[PDB]
Amino acid sequence: GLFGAIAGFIEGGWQGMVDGWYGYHHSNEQGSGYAADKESTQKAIDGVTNKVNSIIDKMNTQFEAVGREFNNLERRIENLNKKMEDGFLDVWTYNAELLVLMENERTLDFHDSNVKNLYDKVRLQLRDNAKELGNGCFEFYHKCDNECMESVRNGTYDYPQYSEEARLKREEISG
Amino acid sequence: GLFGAIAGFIEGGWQGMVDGWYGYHHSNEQGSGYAADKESTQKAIDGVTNKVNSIIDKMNTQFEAVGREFNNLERRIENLNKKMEDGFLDVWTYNAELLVLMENERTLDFHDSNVKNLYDKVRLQLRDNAKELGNGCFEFYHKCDNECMESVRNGTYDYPQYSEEARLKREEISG
Amino acid sequence: GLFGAIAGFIEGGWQGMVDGWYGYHHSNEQGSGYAADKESTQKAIDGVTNKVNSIIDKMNTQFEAVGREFNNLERRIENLNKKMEDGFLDVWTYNAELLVLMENERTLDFHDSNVKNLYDKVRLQLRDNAKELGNGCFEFYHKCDNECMESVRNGTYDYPQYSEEARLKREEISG
Amino acid sequence: QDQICIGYHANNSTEQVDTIMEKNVTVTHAQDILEKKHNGKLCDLDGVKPLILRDCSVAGWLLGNPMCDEFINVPEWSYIVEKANPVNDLCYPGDFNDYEELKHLLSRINHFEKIQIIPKSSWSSHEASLGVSSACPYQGKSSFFRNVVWLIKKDSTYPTIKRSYNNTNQEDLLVLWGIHHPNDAAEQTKLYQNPTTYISVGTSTLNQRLVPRIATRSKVKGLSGRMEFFWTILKPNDAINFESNGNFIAPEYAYKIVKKGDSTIMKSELEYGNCNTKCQTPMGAINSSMPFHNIHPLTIGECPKYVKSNRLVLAIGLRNSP
Amino acid sequence: QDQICIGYHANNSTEQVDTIMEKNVTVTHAQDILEKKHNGKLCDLDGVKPLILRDCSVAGWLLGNPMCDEFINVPEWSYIVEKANPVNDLCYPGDFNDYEELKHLLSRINHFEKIQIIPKSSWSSHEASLGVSSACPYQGKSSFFRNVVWLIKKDSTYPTIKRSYNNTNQEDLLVLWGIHHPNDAAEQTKLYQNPTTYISVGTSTLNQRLVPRIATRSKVKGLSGRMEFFWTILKPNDAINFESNGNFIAPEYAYKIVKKGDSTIMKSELEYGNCNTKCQTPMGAINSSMPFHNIHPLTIGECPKYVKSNRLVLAIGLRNSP
Amino acid sequence: QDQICIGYHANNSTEQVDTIMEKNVTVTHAQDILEKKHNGKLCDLDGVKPLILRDCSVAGWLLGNPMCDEFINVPEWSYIVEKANPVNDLCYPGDFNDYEELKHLLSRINHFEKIQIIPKSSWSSHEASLGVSSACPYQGKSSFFRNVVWLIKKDSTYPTIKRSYNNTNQEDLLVLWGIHHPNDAAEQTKLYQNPTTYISVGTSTLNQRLVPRIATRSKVKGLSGRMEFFWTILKPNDAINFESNGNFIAPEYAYKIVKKGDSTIMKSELEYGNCNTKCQTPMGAINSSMPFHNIHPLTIGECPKYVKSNRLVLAIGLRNSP
Ligand SMILES: CC(=O)N[C@@H]1[C@@H](O)[C@H](O[C@@H]2O[C@H](CO[C@]3(C(=O)O)C[C@H](O)[C@@H](NC(C)=O)[C@H]([C@H](O)[C@H](O)CO)O3)[C@H](O)[C@H](O)[C@H]2O)[C@@H](CO)O[C@H]1O
Ligand SMILES: *[C@@H]1O[C@H](CO)[C@@H](O[C@@H]2O[C@H](CO)[C@@H](O)[C@H](O)[C@H]2NC(C)=O)[C@H](O)[C@H]1NC(C)=O
Ligand SMILES: *[C@@H]1O[C@H](CO)[C@@H](O[C@@H]2O[C@H](CO)[C@@H](O)[C@H](O)[C@H]2NC(C)=O)[C@H](O)[C@H]1NC(C)=O
Ligand SMILES: *[C@@H]1O[C@H](CO)[C@@H](O[C@@H]2O[C@H](CO)[C@@H](O)[C@H](O)[C@H]2NC(C)=O)[C@H](O)[C@H]1NC(C)=O
Ligand SMILES: CC(=O)N[C@H]1[C@H]([C@H](O)[C@H](O)CO)O[C@@](O)(C(=O)O)C[C@@H]1O
Ligand SMILES: *[C@@H]1O[C@H](CO)[C@@H](O)[C@H](O)[C@H]1NC(C)=O
């Protein structure tokens, strides 16, 4: 991927998460489970939906009637028409096919980017209170119960509150 | 954004910087102020300008005369002309609209990317002489006067020269 | 570049590496040399090749015969033909030129991105066992022989195995 | 000791997508942008039903070819449907002058009403009842087109016709007439009496003089004679003046016409299907919002762009690998 | 404590831009790629002024319809402007044969010069001064087209005309003539004497033979007769030969013609505006460099692509949320 | 202090590429997508060789203009090559009715075979050997088109011709005939005897009656007479019936025709080059796989898209700055 996330370090999707596009898995003392980031996910849905809708809605359609109305002493004109129809067919086919390829690429990269951005968001929250494993997972140096992890997601993680405990484990697990 | 910079960690633009597109703010003992990175900025301007100019200049324009020259016993030919004009109108409209959309997206992402690249450039200069706050700002562990900060921008920061002083402050900062 | 790699911190290409697009240079006790990352490189080749092939294959071509069949009392029809041919010429020219520009931009940025992603992969492997010089090179704090470096490339670097030796070397140079 | 992991959605879907750089990438969700479905029926177009001629051609329907179904008055239509090769065209062989332009003119009609312009009963110096052919069979027997009258000499004379009709209606009038080209001089004398003969037609705009062409011709339906038909649009308050010496196929019925837009003649073998659309195809209507289709080139209405493609799938979700 | 921060430009601008994935993104600077402005004037096209016919049609101008402003020797033009429905067309009612092809031919002309081909004074066996009509008034008097002569019998005779003109000029000649179709035999006899009559015209290329059509017609301008006009291009060193029995509307003036390119006839109600352009619209000229416009479909010149859009705004600066 | 570095390929290549944001970016490898090369020859098109008319026009070749090469029968072709201004067209001056539609019809032919339809020796009441002109020289002698016969009165009489030909072949038949327009009544009398004359031609579909037009004309090749040619397609088991009083240019040879597809007439000065292609240009053939070309607009076959561009270079490798 462009952002090395989706098929890079996070080497795989979770069938367990079904309530969103991007989100979290956790395992503590209290149990393990999935949660979904409703913000990044809904923003993504809005984005992609808008993209589809705009590939659809920007097309001007007007009445036309086609059309074989020339006789056998008007074949030159008939050929002019053929050239025109064939021309437009070529233009539209090439354009549509390429547009789909290009925008599909952009879409997958957009997903990649969203994932990576969520990752870095969490990473900036935790710093040295946890270790990066390199698979999109953070091994906590302190004790993070359900309330703590919901604070990680919510963007409300209290770094100094665990910094010492972590510092012990670190500077004891790094022992 | 694709590069999580512009509306990601640097959550907002500076009205104070008016002499460029991307750059710096500083606050030391001697005072606070804005400076602009004239290299990343001018390269960006050249890029975008070239983009606009090339969307404009690649267009072939030739003389045409249009055109209602068919009489009321030539309405089949008249209809052929209509289908042609309408065809081109649809082609050009769809292409122009989509081109604008696509390239606008690319432009904003280009800005995002430039910002992020400036950030990482500085980050690689400073290392542990400063702390990343996570808002595009670096809190210095040592004393960085005007000459020092101009050296950060210029790409001429002397890391070992402050590494110890920084190392001390870093130390006293923890326990 | 978008990803600040190719003409950013890695300020130049290696004529010494000829067996791939992206890869490694090393210098140890045992000698200095080039190796190429065959995974990022072949993925890139498949990508770009697919891009070219798809710009080529999406084009619908059908039989046409053109064509000056109208006499000197049919010059209005002849003019209708001319406007059509001219029309398609302008359309195809503009589209082909812009398509080439746009996709070329995308291709170079893709290279940029692949390079940057390789860099960050190595960076995440090594952490503090090595120093980032800021030119796409990592100065090792420990001793990395051929086997060790092949383990850096292979994605099989044993960070704890050298962490202490590195840790020793580390605090030293700092005064 | 505890973990926080970042990851992304996955499922069992097999929806595939192509990419500029990669083919057959399994993906979480996808949307096709290409319309491939039609209802197999002939429908109204924006609320207006089509004129469906069954085994009748436009010419056969306008002149009233006896073997065409009896003129039901459709006062309005959005397009015309003809079969590829309609069986009932011109029952007496010949031609329609400017026929394709006439069909195009009639392809969409805001108002259409057949009226009697010159009663048959009004030809007192000519036979109006013997103008009949076996090639034009009706109610058992030798007949003729119903809207138009084949005049023949009465006793052994064909005095000069001078007849005029003033369009006192409030709408344009489609007027039709014809000329008969016989096989030889003998037939010319037998039907009309005068050997050298003409038909002149005059309007504010039309200045026409038709002369029959005698020539030896192949039999078509057993006949060597030919009938050639002509037409104009008579404006409100204009008159049309006919003068003729013989070989005149006179108007009887004409049509009030109101034209506001244009379409075309659709060639299709289908039947009406009591529906409505914005886009009609000869294979069936399209219920559309998609910007592209691959049904058929020959469409009428506000249609998506015709394309040569079986598939235009946009990725919406993400890579859904095993 | 000390800080270094990275950031980007912002301002108070409200320029908005759309994006494939997002709408109405406020941005630092933007550039529209769509031309929407025109000068509301009729201008020269690449340095060449148009032929502006005021209330005159092309036919009315070429034949010199008396009520058309007096012959503007414009020797050169790049396009022709006509009003939608010009008041002064054919003063005597009738038709121009191959009219639209003639208008297209004349739409852009490199050199034009009216010259006298057959002096009026040269019809000694025929009346050249009585060919006058109240439908063609010059100043309350009955007149006629000025470039063409309505010949009438002299005393009670119309001897056969045989007249030839050899194009000794160095350029093609546009030659115009006509035939008069009367209302009845009596008028035929009154104007020309001969009852059965013709006009033959011959060139290296042209082999024409015109016969008048008598028919009863509606009055137009109170007249039932009709005038039908015809034209050729006579090559240098070719001759044109007229022979006629009556109903001849003879050339007097013809035109030297040099044609190098082609344009079209613009329908517009505007007036000349002493400017210059590369792209003319009926609503006004376009000073262009933009690749697209939305002014009007009917353009002449080197014009940007017509498009159905009110806005094509390229983002140049950056997101400017404030 | 040992090192590991990451980097990318470079070389001495000077291949340049343009980009949306940057121009003239030197790069490692590139591929042009635009075809610029042609072989300068006329070739077969998908295995079928073209009918190359040398200094002959289609009309000249079909009627057999004596000065056109006589060659062995080409039974099949894919397109027709004519020179811009072929020297041998109609040796006797005149016209071909519906000529361009005939050329279009003939442009691609699946089967063509000339056959004798009416033997010359079969005109016993007319002279078939004096129909000869200095404007149609064969070997220093006055001759005529070879495929068609100019009948003249025998002794001082031209009895009425009634001749018919039934197409008993299994293919459509292209039939050609003509009418002669003389300069005056005297010539009319000298050649044919009858002063007032006609040619009628009838088919299951054709109903034609031609009358010569006498007019005074300029000399072309020293001649003031004109010859006008017509044609039909006679279906299998249909007959064609000619009747004529004089001025008849009778068929002698006709052509069996099988048509399966269509092309056009290519104007080119080149010569055959014993090759094959899918795409032929008047400047030479294109060996193509590229989607675009800039050779010439006037192509026949399966060709890439014509474009106004000298260069369409795709970046494949990477930036190769020094
Ligand atoms: C005097 C007489 O009746 N003549 C008879 C021949 O005509 C006849 O040969 C047959 O000709 C048939 C044509 O008959 C028609 C027709 O269309 O049905 C008869 C129509 O009544 C007549 N209509 C009018 C207004 O005259 C019509 C008309 O003359 C032509 O269509 C004009 O071109 O002729 C038919 O073609 C048969 O195929 C053919 O056998 C023979 C045998 O009956 O006897 C004659 O007495
Ligand atoms: C058709 O008949 C109508 C009605 O009689 C004619 O219309 C009138 O014509 C007279 C002059 O002849 C005028 O005084 C009336 O004012 C006309 N009425 C309208 C509403 O136009 C008409 O002229 C006849 N048309 C022709 C061609 O003879
Ligand atoms: C128009 O007039 C010119 C000049 O008289 C004619 O050209 C001459 O034709 C004669 C007759 O054979 C030639 O012998 C001369 O050599 C020609 N002179 C020139 C300048 O070419 C011309 O033929 C006339 N056109 C017609 C059709 O009569
Ligand atoms: C052309 O010749 C054919 C061959 O004889 C004619 O066809 C025959 O018509 C007779 C009736 O007179 C039938 O007995 C045969 O069945 C016919 N043969 C075929 C194959 O149809 C044909 O009518 C002639 N065409 C014309 C227009 O005269
Ligand atoms: C069949 C015939 O009699 N041909 C003679 C013609 C005709 O009188 C005219 O061409 C008719 O227009 O005139 C010639 O001068 C010619 O053309 O060579 C002599 C020629 O033998
Ligand atoms: C490509 O996609 C089509 C549709 O899913 C599938 O039939 C085919 O097997 C795929 N090709 C490959 C590479 O397997």
| CB of D222 sitting under 6 A from ligand 1 | yes
Nearest by CB to residue B4, choosing from A61, A110, A120, is A120
d(CA F43, CA F40): 10
* Cβ–Cβ under 8 Å, residues C158 and C150: no
d(CA C118, CA C140): 17
Method used for this model?
X-ray
One domain, residues F122 and F174: yes
From the CA of D313, the nearest ligand is: 6
C-alpha triplet D241, D244, D249: angle, nearest 5°: 90
One domain, residues D108 and D205: yes
Amino acid E151 reads L
One domain, residues E194 and E281: no
Q: Which domain holds residue D317?
A: 1-48+271-322
Q: Which domain holds residue A113?
A: 1-175
- Quick one: tokens of F289? 């796989």
Beta bridge mates, E164 = E241
Distance from CA of A89 to the nearest CA of D (A): 6
Resolution for the entry shown, Å: 2.4
Q: Counting atoms of ligand 3 from 1, which one is nearest the CA of E167?
A: 1
E61-to-E68, E91, E112, E252, F227 alpha-carbon distances in Å: 7, 11, 13, 15, 36
Q: What is the count of residue pairs from B and E with beta carbons less than 8 Å apart?
A: 215
Does the CB of D315 have a partner CB in chain E at under 8 Å? no
User: Which of B40, B51, B111 has the highest number of chain F CBs within 10 A, making it the mutation to test binding with F?
Assistant: B51
Cα-based torsion angle of the residue sequence C104, C107, C113, C116 in order, rounded to the nearest 10 degrees: -90
CATH code of residue C27: 3.90.20.10
d(CA F161, CA F179): 14
- Quick one: tokens of B54? 């090339």
* Cβ–Cβ under 8 Å, residues E224 and E183: yes
| CB of D191 sitting under 6 A from ligand 1 | yes
One domain, residues D37 and D82: no
Give the three-class secondary structure for D61. Answer: helix
CA of C102 to the centre of ligand 6 (A): 29
d(CA F10, CA F27): 9
Distance from CA of F299 to the nearest CA of A (A): 12
Task: Scan for tokens 């003509």, then name that residue.
Answer: F178
CA of D18 to the centre of ligand 6 (A): 10
Distance from CA of B150 to the nearest CA of C (A): 19
- Parallel, antiparallel or unpaired: strands F313-315 and F30-32: antiparallel
Integer distance in angstroms from the first to the last C-alpha of chain D?
A: 29
Q: Kindly list the residues from chain E whose CB atom is less than 8 angstroms away from the CB atom of residue A103.
A: 20
Nearest by CB to residue C102, choosing from F2, F20, F264, is F20
Question: What DSSP letter does each residue of F171-191 carry, written as one string?
Answer: SEEEEEEEEEE-SSHHHHHHH
Nearest by CB to residue F2, choosing from C56, C62, C144, is C144
Q: Counting atoms of ligand 4 from 1, which one is nearest the CA of D219?
A: 27
Residues 6 or more apart whose CB falls under 8 angstroms from that of D74 comprise D49, D51, D112
One domain, residues E321 and E202: no
Are D214 and F203 inside 8 Å of each other by CB? no
* Cβ–Cβ under 8 Å, residues C155 and C148: no
d(CA E49, CA B79): 31
CA of F168 to the centre of ligand 4 (A): 9
* CA atoms within 13 A of residue F4's CA, in its CB half-sphere: 29
Number of separate domains in chain C: 1
* Cβ–Cβ under 8 Å, residues F309 and C97: yes
Nearest by CB to residue B69, choosing from E79, E265, E318, is E265
Q: Please report how the helices A75-126 and F99-106 are oriented relative to each other, as an axis angle in degrees rounded to 10.
A: 60
One domain, residues F196 and F58: yes
- Quick one: tokens of A121? 């968001």
CA of E106 to the centre of ligand 3 (A): 28
One domain, residues D80 and D145: yes
- Quick one: tokens of F105? 């019809």
Amino acid D20 reads I
b (16+ CB within 10 A) / e for B21-54: bbbbbbbbeeeeebbbbeebbebbeebbebbbeb
One domain, residues E266 and E294: no
Q: Report the neighbours of A using a cutoff of 3 or more CB pairs below 8 angstroms.
A: B, C, D, E, F
Task: Scan for tokens 């299951």, then name that residue.
Answer: F204
Integer distance in angstroms from the first to the last C-alpha of chain C?
A: 37
Give the three-class secondary structure for E310. Answer: coil
Does the CB of E175 have a partner CB in chain F at under 8 Å? no
One domain, residues D216 and D79: yes
One domain, residues F72 and F4: no
Among left, alpha and beta (phi > 0; psi -120 to 50; other), residue A119 is alpha
Are B109 and C2 inside 8 Å of each other by CB? yes
Q: Counting atoms of ligand 5 from 1, which one is nearest the CA of F131?
A: 1
Residue A5 DSSP label: I
* CA atoms within 13 A of residue D161's CA, in its CB half-sphere: 33
Number of separate domains in chain D: 2
Are B8 and A117 inside 8 Å of each other by CB? yes
Q: Does F202 sit behind a cis peptide bond, omega within 30 degrees of 0 on the bond before it?
A: no
**Which contacts of C139-143 are long-range, i.e. CB under 8 A and separated by 24 or more positions?**
C139/F1, C139/F3, C140/C166, C140/F1, C140/F2, C140/F3, C140/F4, C141/C165, C141/C166, C141/C167, C141/C169, C141/C170, C142/C166, C142/C169, C143/C28, C143/C29, C143/F2
Does the CB of E235 have a partner CB in chain C at under 8 Å? no
From the CA of F218, the nearest ligand is: 3
- Quick one: tokens of D39? 């209802």
Nearest by CB to residue A73, choosing from F101, F264, F305, is F101
Q: Please report how the helices B75-126 and A75-126 are oriented relative to each other, as an axis angle in degrees rounded to 10.
A: 20
Domain end residue (candidates: F270, F291, F308): F270
d(CA E72, CA E297): 30
One domain, residues F223 and F277: no
* Cβ–Cβ under 8 Å, residues E220 and D204: yes
Q: Kindly list the residues from chain B whose CB atom is less than 8 angstroms away from the CB atom of residue D262.
A: 75, 79
- Parallel, antiparallel or unpaired: strands D226-234 and D94-96: parallel
Q: Whose CA is nearest to atom 18 of ligand 4?
A: F237
**Which residue in A has a C-alpha nearest to residue B133's C-alpha?**
A124
Instruction: Tell me the best of D170, D173, D203, D237 to mutate to test the pocket of ligand 2, counting ligand atoms within 8 Å of each CB and taking the most.
Output: D237
d(CA D76, CA D206): 27
Give the three-class secondary structure for F305. Answer: strand
| CB of D130 sitting under 6 A from ligand 1 | yes
CA of D223 to the centre of ligand 4 (A): 15
Residues 6 or more apart whose CB falls under 8 angstroms from that of F186 comprise none
CA of F214 to the centre of ligand 3 (A): 23
Question: What DSSP letter does each residue of D116-163 carry, written as one string?
Answer: ESS-GGG-SSEESSS--EEEEE-SSSEE--SSEEE-EEBTTB-PPEEE
Nearest by CB to residue B80, choosing from C79, C80, C97, is C80
Which H or E run contains C85? helix C75-126
d(CA F106, CA C69): 12
For residue D11, report the phi and psi dihedrals to the nearest 5 degrees: -155, -170
**Which residue in C has a C-alpha nearest to residue B125's C-alpha?**
C134
- Cα torsion angle, D119, D125, D130, D133, sign: negative
One domain, residues F112 and F258: yes
Are A74 and F98 inside 8 Å of each other by CB? no
- Cα torsion angle, B42, B48, B52, B53, sign: positive
Instruction: Tell me the best of D216, D217, D218 to mutate to test the pocket of ligand 4, counting ligand atoms within 8 Å of each CB and taking the most.
Output: D218
Task: Scan for tokens 């007096």, then name that residue.
Answer: E70
Q: Which residues of A touch E (CB under 8 A)?
A: 47-48, 50-51, 54, 60, 103, 106, 110
- Quick one: tokens of B135? 């808002």
